[PDB]
Each structure stands twice: as C-alpha cells, then as structure tokens.
A paper describes a structure:
The human mitoribosome comprises a 39 S large subunit (mt-LSU) and a 28 S small subunit (mt-SSU). Human mitoribosomes synthesize 13 polypeptides, all crucial components in the oxidative phosphorylation (OxPhos) complexes. In this study, we focus on exploring the function of GTPBP8, the human homolog of EngB. Structural analysis of mitoribosomes from GTPBP8 knock-out cells shows the accumulation of mitoribosomal large subunit assembly intermediates that are incapable of forming functional monosomes.
Therefore, we performed FLAG-IP of C-terminally FLAG-tagged mS27 (mS27::FLAG) overexpressed in the GTPBP8KO1 cell line and subjected the enriched mt-SSU complexes for cryo-EM. As for the mt-SSU, we were able to classify the particles into four different classes which represent a mixture of late mt-SSU assembly intermediates and mature mt-SSU. Specifically, 37 % of the total amount of particles represent mt-SSU sub-assemblies, all of which lack the last MRP recruited to mt-SSU, mS37 (State 1 and State 2). Indeed, in both biological replicates of GTPBP8 knock-outs, mS37 is the most downregulated MRP of the mt-SSU, as assessed both via western blotting and mass spectrometry. Aligning with this finding, our cryo-EM data revealed the presence of the stable mt-SSU assembly intermediates lacking mS37, while the rest of the resolved mt-SSU complexes (~60 %) were fully matured and associated with translation initiation factors.
Author numbering:
A (entry chain D): 345 to 430
B (entry chain U): 27 to 103
C (entry chain 0): 165 to 218
D (entry chain 0): 4 to 55
E (entry chain O): 46 to 239
F (entry chain R): 64 to 358
G (entry chain M): 10 to 128
H (entry chain T): 2 to 169
The structure:
Amino acid sequence: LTQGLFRGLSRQETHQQLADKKGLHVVEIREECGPLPIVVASPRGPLRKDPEPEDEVPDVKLDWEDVKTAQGMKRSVWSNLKRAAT
Amino acid sequence: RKTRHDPLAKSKIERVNMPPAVDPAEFFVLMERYQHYRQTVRALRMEFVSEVQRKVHEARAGVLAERKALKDAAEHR
Amino acid sequence: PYPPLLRAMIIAERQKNGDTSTEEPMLNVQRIRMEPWDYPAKQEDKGRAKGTPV
Amino acid sequence: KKVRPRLIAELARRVRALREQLNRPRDSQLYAVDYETLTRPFSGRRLPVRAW
Amino acid sequence: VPISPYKDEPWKYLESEEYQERYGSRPVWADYRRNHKGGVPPQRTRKTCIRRNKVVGNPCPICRDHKLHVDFRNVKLLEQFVCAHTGIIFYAPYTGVCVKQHKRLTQAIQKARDHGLLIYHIPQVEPRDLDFSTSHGAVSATPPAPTLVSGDPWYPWYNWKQPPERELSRLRRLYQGHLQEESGPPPESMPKMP
Amino acid sequence: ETKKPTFMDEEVQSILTKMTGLNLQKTFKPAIQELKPPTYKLMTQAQLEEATRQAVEAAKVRLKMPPVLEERVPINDVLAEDKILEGTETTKYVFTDISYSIPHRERFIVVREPSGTLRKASWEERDRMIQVYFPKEGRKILTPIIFKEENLRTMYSQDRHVDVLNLCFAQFEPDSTEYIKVHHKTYEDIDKRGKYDLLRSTRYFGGMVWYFVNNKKIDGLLIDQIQRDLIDDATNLVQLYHVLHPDGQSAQGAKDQAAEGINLIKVFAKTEAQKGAYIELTLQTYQEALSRHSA
Amino acid sequence: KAYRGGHLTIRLALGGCTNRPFYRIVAAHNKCPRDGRFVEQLGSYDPLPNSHGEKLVALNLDRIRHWIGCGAHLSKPMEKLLGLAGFFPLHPMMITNAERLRRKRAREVLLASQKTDAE
Amino acid sequence: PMKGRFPIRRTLQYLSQGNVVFKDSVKVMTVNYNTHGELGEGARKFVFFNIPQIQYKNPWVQIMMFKNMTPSPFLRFYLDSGEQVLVDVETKSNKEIMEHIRKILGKNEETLREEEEEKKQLSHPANFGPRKYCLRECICEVEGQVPCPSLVPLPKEMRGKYKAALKA
Ligand code: FES
Ligand SMILES: [Zn+2]
C-alpha cells in the first residue's frame, strides 16, 4: 500500500502537461461558478486549431462500485459514517 | 360493533327511548329552513353536474379536440 | 341568489373573459319540485322482512 | 390460476333461496300486533312510542 | 467555583493572550480525541459533559474551558464549527462536542444569521408570479349584492318569521303531552354580559 | 399625447442594462455550498470563445432587472354581513382556494369574522396563506427580524446590501409596503456612503437609478461614474433624467445648446444638480487626465 | 375493495396527536374507515387558533365541485364549513343554534340585572 | 471492471439519453441488419447502442431483430391501424436513423412537456400526508400553528385531563 501509493501519486499527469501533450486549453467547470469556464492551464507551444473528435460513446472500462453507487444500489451500513476530523 | 348473530343484552330488554319534546314554533320554522336550504342546494348540485358533462363532452367531441386530431393525422400523412 | 362566494367567482370569470354585465347570477329553483316528507313512496321497489320468526 | 370449484356454496345458495320462496311468512304473521304489549310476536320488537 | 469574567462580553476571550497561548491559530477542537472501542466510533457523542455540577473525565472542547461561551455575538467561536467552504455546521462526532453544546451551537449559529452577524449564502431566487396585475375580483372590489345594500340577509329564511296560529295548533295536536313552551321571536342582536 | 417612459421600456432598459455592466467574476462568484468535483474539458481557442459567449447569455438572464411596481392598494371589500352569527364564535376562519391551476393573484381568500362578516383577506393575510399551502423556498410565514432597522444597519456596515435585497425579494412581493421601504433604505444608505459599485453587475442597479432619477439624487452616482472613467454611463444618466423630466432647466438648456456627450453633464451640473461645484471639479480632473493619455 | 351498496362522501378525516386535532378534508367511500383509504384530499381544517388568532380552512373548490357533480354527499360538519365560507347557504341548524344561544343569553341577563337591581 | 465491451450502455444514465418516444400507433418494430458489409455498418451500431435506449423508453413496443435475411438492412414499424412503415437505413449512420425515426414516428418536445406537467398536478403542496406522497404530514410543522404535543407540551387548559377534573 505504501509502495503502490507513491507509485500512483508520482505518475499522475498535471493540467499543464495535458495541455502541452494535446496543445489545447484545460478548462475547469464548476457548479458553484455555473457555466463560467476557468482556464487552469494553457500550452506554451502552438495551440491546436482543430478540436478533439467528439466520441458518441467512450470505450472506457468502468467500475461497478461507482456505477452501483450513482444508481442508488450500494447498500452498506458502514459507508458515509460520522467520524472525527481527519 | 355487534353482528346480526349476536344476542341482545339483558339490560336493554326493557328500554323505551321516549322522543324529545317539540316546540311548535321552532319546529315549524326549522322545517321550512330545511325545505329552502335543500332546494337551494339541489340547484347548485345540478349546476356542478352540468359542468362535468360539458368537460367530458368537450374533450372527446369538442371543437378544440377534433381540430387537433386532424392536425395530428394530417402531419402523419 | 347564489351564495356569496360563488357569486363572487361568477362575476370574476365574466370580467376575466372581458364580458361586462350588471346582471345578477341567479339559480333556477323552478325545476326543483320540493315534495313533502309524507309523500307516498314506491312500495314496488321496497323490501320485505325475512323469514326468521322469533 | 384455476380456481378450485366450490359446489356446496352454490347448492346451499339455491336451497336457501328456494326455502325463502316456499316458507315465506305472510302478511298475517309479519304484521300481527299484540295490543296489550304492543309488540310484533313474529320478531318481538316494540313499536315506536308515537305509534302506540 | 469557575466564574468566567467574559460572561457578558464573550468575544474578548478569543482576542486575548490566554486563548492564543492555549489554542493559537487552530480551532479549540483541534487537539481533542474521543476514547472508544474500535476504529469506528459511535454515531452520537455523549449527551453532556457536566452532570450535577460535575465534569467527566474527558470534557469536550466547549466544556473543558469555562471561558468559552456559546453566544450568538461570539461569531469568532461559531465560525470554527461551520465549514468555510460549504457553510455546513459539522456534526458532533466531527468536533467532539456533546449533544447539549452542539444543540446550543446550532441555535446560536442560526440566531447569528438572523441578526446579520454571520455571513451565509443567500441565493437569488425567481419571482413567485409570472403576472402582477391586481384587477381580478379576488383582490379587487366586488359589486355589492342588493341584499347587502338594503341591510337584509342573503336569504329571507335566515330571519325568524312568526308562524301562523293554525299551524302551531297542528303540532300541538300532533305531539300531545310531549311539548315544550313556545318560543318567541329571538332578539335582533346577541346580548352581552355587562 | 406625451407619455413618460416607464421602467420596462426598451429605450430605458437598454440604458440601465449598459450602466449595470457585465462582470463574470462577480456575477458567477463561487457560491459557498455543497461542492462536487469539477469537470475538465480540452477546449481550443474557438471553443473557449463560444463557452464564454454562453456565459454572457446566461449572465444577462441572471441580471434581468425586476419590474418596479407601486404600492398596492389595501383590500377592503365585504362580501356578506350575517348578523345572526354574531357571538357564536370567538375566533375567525380563513378559507383559501387551494386549486393548483390558478394564479395566486386570482385566488379567493375570504375571512368569516366573529361578527358574521364575510370579507376578503388582506394582502398581509393573502401572502401568509399562500406560503402555508404553496411554500416557496426562501420565504417565511413570519416576517424575519433581520428587516428591522437595527439588524439592517448591521448588514449595511458589512457592505452586504445585495444580500438585503435578495432576502426581501424572497420574502416580500414587489408591490408590498415592506419591499419598497427595505429597498429605499438600502439605496439611501448607498448614496450616503457612496457604495454604488456593490450593486453594479446585478439586477438591483436599474432599480436604484430609477429611484434617484425620480427623486433627483443622481449627483452621487454621476460623480462615482466620472471617477471610474465611465463618461458613457454618466451621459446616458443625464439623458435619461431629461426624458423623465422634460420641463426642467437642464433639458431646456441642452436643446438650446444642443449639448452632447460631456457637455450634457456641464449643463446639468449648473442648472439643476445640487452639487454643481463638486461635479465640475470632478469632471475637470478627469478631462485633464484623458488629455495626457492621448498624447 | 368492493362494498355492497354505498356511495362517496366529502367528510373530515381526523388526524394529529392527543389534544391536537387536525382534520383533512377528503372524498372517501361511505363504508371506508374515517382515516382509512380516500379517493382524494380536498383540503384541511385546523380547529386550534394560531398565533394570529385564526382557524385555517383549505378548500379545493375546483375539485369539490367535481365530486359533488359525480354523486358525492356532504357531511354536516363539511356542510357548515361551506356556509361559513359562502360556497353553500348557512346550514339551518347554524341559524337555529344561534337563536337558542341568544334566548339563553337573554334569559341570563335578567337574573344578573335582578340581582344587581333587587340586591 | 464492468464486463463486456462498452459497459457504459448498461447504465441508467445512458438508457435515459434516448429522445425517441414513439406514439401510441407504433406497436411492433422490426430491425433487419446484416452482420457484414460496409453499407450495413450504421445498422450494426444502431443495434449496439440505440436499440437499448428505444426499448427503455418504449417498453410496451415489441422490438424484434433478424440477421442476414435480406441483402440490405431496413427498419419496419407496424402501426395499430394496420399501416407498415418501411425505413431503408442503408448507407446511413446510427445518428441519422435515430433522428429519422424521431421525426416521422417520434414525439416532439412540446408534446412531452405537457405529459410531465400533468404529473405535477398529482402532487399538491397543500395536501398533508406521508413523505412518500405529500410534503408535510400534519399542520403542526407550519410555523404559527399549535405544535405537536410530543415536542411542545400544550397548556393544562387545552388538555382533556384537567378539563374533566376542573369541571368535576
Ligand atoms: S404530528 Fe401534527 S400533532 Fe403530532
Ligand atoms: Zn460537553
């Protein structure tokens, strides 16, 4: 758990790299700020003039634990329990 | 409450409910108020009954209901 | 007459639809024939005591 | 979903209806009145006090 | 006996040097931990830390210091029990306060928001009505009925009308021996007890 | 003949919309509420312009100035008087027609008093009854205590004038007696303390300009606009003032001199403005600074 | 459920805790329980006076006129709430009980006067 | 992870993204598609993505599929009047088929709002009852009205215990 946590926390891609890798703007959308688009990172190099091809459905492997929670099916008497400040 | 097959009580065998005393004036006056009240409420009931027929007949054979079935059928063709 | 509130709601539809009139709403109580309480009813639609002698 | 027939409830129903039509009480029995106790011997029910 | 001197002005204790030397810049509940079995604690904290003028072993942040007064004017202490990012009052197990003080904090926090002392998110709602005309009879004037202008009842039968003698005679005959004294016309207005 | 523009006229709304301005950072300020993790989208230069263009369309729908109405007239209408029911009851009944498909201003709410009088419910009673059967988020049956003079001042001291107006809009109706008094107090304090900027880029700015122009108290607002390099807004305010008051000294003077732009402020400053001297000094300084930038 | 005979009635369904009565106007079958199954809820009545001193009576006039035109009866308490509102005429017994109360109070003023007069 | 390719299809969010609500006429829907060939590619993607969305919105409409029965793919709807609607979907993408059947046999946005507004009149805010059906259970939850005795004890003058003792 310790050797795996540092491995995943060091191999995470930032918003600046994502922009540089794809030469596009990384925009942050927040419900509290409504539809306003917040630019968190922009590429230092040539900004691409063509948008990413939109995909009707994405072939991304999902997690049943997350899908089961969003559909209101994960019954557990131990989740979201009142605990102390951490 | 009791049923039809339950025997009657033995304390009520010899019970006679005497009707209340009648005041000639109030009773006569009270018999006319009911006479008029019920005639005024029967007319309103008929009115309320007449509005339920219209609405029912204004939805299946109405002018605004037969004018939309042709619009929906004309757009289908 | 109509009772006070109903009369007030019948005069507000008129003015909402735009109809302007000074006539009173009135109920036709000529149809309702109020018969006495001691008027002979129908004995040919009335029931009979069951055969349970006591 | 095939209801098991109940024949005794139909046999009795016909018999009870038939008896009500052959043993029916007459007007002389139903509407007799004892004029001293003011009760209907058939049912033993007192009349109302305003009719006495 | 503990007689806190900031009872009347509780906000002066948080801006003193005794508070900074004990708590500093962190909240009063930063260094509090509950004692329980397991890793998962009970969903409710103890009802109260003071029973008949006796404090328990491990008092909560509000009960261990007698100079901390839960009042609606002490906004600096009530901000430590409200999230600064979501504006939600934390539940008891979070801070460790007892039900009695957490029930007193919520009441003090809702009273500081009703007095304009505590800042809270106020949304921009929409109008209740799409129209604003006040010409309808429901909120306007209705043509007075004739009976109302003549000082008469809506219906005639409302008023008492004396019945004829011949008809009362029928009733008397109809109900012999089971009668009550005839009633005269009632007074026009209800009497009052002087 | 000659009708004076109202608050909802296209010519006036366009002027008050421009004065209000549009600031996305202030219009879509991060609300303090339950939060969710944000979503990220890889956008191009053109996709970012269209996303910001949709925010300007939603901010103009969120800045829609609420209509300004006049104090509603009390409801004193008796439907029936039944003297036979006098003394038979101690408390009064309040009947409400809870039919769904009916506007709340066409709903019948009557009161049968202990004297047998069947009257119509008053405005204060109507609004209360509609919140009991048709509750609206933000509104309370019992008038809150924040709208008291002492509590309101506390809020004014924290520069929370936009919060007082939002609470009033969610508790009282535009044509109430409490919605007009609570608004005017907020506007009056703004003029005294010169806090006009707070209501800028909101839906309560147009209503604040409509109260000063009609009560002739635009000297403070005009000065603030001049001190923020906003001559365009400053000149449209005098033009608006003229329109509402055609038979005024400034309006007549303008036509005579055909004053335009900055000239209007000068003509108005002398003839009508209460603070004529201060406006000229403030306007003077601005003009001098502008010349340096042009050089 | 099917009942032999019966009909619909606009009555009051008692609710609330002990010493806190709250009625909720409903259209329900005659043979159904007072607070049992109902076809529709047409309003509410709060007998206890509120802080302002008034009794709240919610009436769904639109739906009350529909069920009255479908064959629904009215209970005496519900027929007296519509007379107070002005939807129906004052129930005869509301007028007769008011006359009895007057005679009663006029009979007690004599005794009170005599006492102060005679004594 | 979630088994199968494109597991997002087996989600309530994706099944409710369909905007094709058939009318009352549409009773039976038949899909004839070819497993192989370039021309039939759209129909294969229509059966892989969109068919679940249509059956979720139209659960009482029969949807039957037939493989390699004809040289070209096509859709055919059977109305309740006896009319058959042929829809040649060859040389077409799945998005075109979904937008084509929504125009000839699907409902618009005006007809759908009306249906939803009819369900808002079934839940009256004034009505009192259980949380499942109504917002409030009693009128003791309304500020101003007499509170429930459980939370606030009523005065001794409003209780029938003392009234009886007081009377006698
Ligand atoms: S729930 Fe309303 S009184 Fe107990
Ligand atoms: Zn404690």
